C-alpha cells in the first residue's frame, strides 16, 4: 500500500528530523544548552543561548508549516473519501469513472489504520459482437424509433436490444414509437412491425 505508507513514513521522518535538529549548533559552540551554562558565565553565553533559541524556533516553524500542509492535503483526501462513501456506498452513483473503472453497482467499505478502502463492484462487458444498425424502421410510411433499445440485425432479420446486453426481441409496437413521416432520416431501412393487437382481435 502506497497511500497509507507515505502518510506514516513522512511523519516519522519529520519527527526524526526534529530530533536531529537538536544535535546541531546553528553556528554556536555547542549543541546542548547545558554545556555553555557549565563552562561559560550566563552574562557572556547569552548570545549563544539566543542563537540556539532562534535556530530551534526556525526548525519548529518549518515543522509547523509542513504539518499544516500535510493536514491540508489530509483534509482534502478525507473530504474526497467522505464523498466517495456517501455516493458509492450509501447508494448507487451515476458518475462514470468515479467509483472505479466500469459501471458501478455498490461498494463495501473496510476499516484501515489511519485510512479507508472501498470495495467497488463494477460492471464491464466481456464479449461483444458486431451488428448492423439503423436509427428508424419504415413500416407504412411512419418511422419507428426504439424507446430504450437500438435496432440491430444479424444479417437476415432485425431485432431490438438494450445498450449493455444482447437480448434480441421481435420488432413490435410496445417498444417503439412513431414520429413524423418516413422521408426525414438520411439512413432508414424497410421492415415490418409485429403489431400484437391484430392477431388477437380475430
Amino acid at each position: 500500500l502506497g497511500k497509507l505508507q507515505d502518510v506514516v513514513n513522512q511523519n516519522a521522518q519529520a519527527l526524526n528530523t526534529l530530533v536531529k535538529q537538536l544535535s546541531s549548533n546553528f553556528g554556536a559552540i555547542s549543541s546542548v544548552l547545558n554545556d555553555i551554562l557549565s563552562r561559560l558565565d550566563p552574562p557572556e553565553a547569552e548570545v549563544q543561548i539566543d542563537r540556539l533559541i532562534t535556530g530551534r524556533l526556525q526548525s519548529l516553524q518549518t515543522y509547523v508549516t509542513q504539518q499544516l500542509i500535510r493536514a491540508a492535503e489530509i483534509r482534502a483526501s478525507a473530504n474526497l473519501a467522505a464523498t466517495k462513501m456517501s455516493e458509492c456506498v450509501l447508494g448507487q452513483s451515476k458518475r462514470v469513472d468515479f467509483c472505479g473503472k466500469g459501471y458501478h453497482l455498490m461498494s463495501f467499505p473496510q476499516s484501515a489504520p489511519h485510512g479507508v478502502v472501498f470495495l467497488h463492484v463494477t460492471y464491464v462487458p466481456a464479449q461483444e459482437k458486431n451488428f448492423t444498425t439503423a436509427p428508424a424502421i419504415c413500416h407504412d410510411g411512419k418511422a419507428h424509433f426504439p424507446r430504450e433499445g437500438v435496432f440491430v440485425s444479424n444479417g437476415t432479420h432485425w431485432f431490438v436490444t438494450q445498450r449493455n446486453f444482447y437480448e434480441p426481441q421481435i420488432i413490435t409496437t410496445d417498444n417503439t414509437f412513431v414520429s413524423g413521416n418516413c422521408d426525414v432520416v438520411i439512413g432508414i431501412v424497410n421492415n415490418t412491425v409485429y403489431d400484437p393487437l391484430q392477431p388477437e382481435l380475430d
Binding site: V96, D97, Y103, E128, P135, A136, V150, V185
Partner: protein
C-alpha cells in the same frame, strides 16, 4: 535564462507530443465509441446513435435529432468556427 544561478528546471516526464497523442486517442474513443471505451472495451457505434443517446440523457426523445440532423450538424460546425475565432483573438 534562470538556470545560471543553479535554479535548474526539471524536464517533464511527459512531453507535449504524447500529451497530444493522449488527447487524440481520447478524442477518437469519444467519437467512435461514446462512453463504452471509458468503462470497458470499446464498442463501435455510429455518431448519430451517440448523439441521440446524449439527447436521451437530458430528457429529450431521440426522434428529434434525425428530423433535423443537418441543422444540428451545421450548428455544431458554426460553434466550432466560433470557438476557434474567439480563441484566435488571452
Amino acid at each position: 535564462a534562470q538556470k545560471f544561478n543553479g535554479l535548474t528546471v526539471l524536464p517533464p516526464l511527459l512531453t507535449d507530443e504524447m500529451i497530444a497523442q493522449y488527447t487524440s486517442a481520447l478524442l477518437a474513443g469519444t467519437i467512435t465509441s461514446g462512453w463504452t471505451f471509458g468503462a470497458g472495451p470499446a464498442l463501435q457505434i455510429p455518431f448519430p446513435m451517440q448523439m441521440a443517446y446524449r439527447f436521451n440523457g437530458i430528457g429529450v426523445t431521440q426522434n428529434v435529432l434525425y428530423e433535423n440532423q443537418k441543422l444540428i450538424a451545421n450548428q455544431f460546425n458554426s460553434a466550432i468556427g466560433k470557438i476557434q475565432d474567439s480563441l484566435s483573438s488571452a
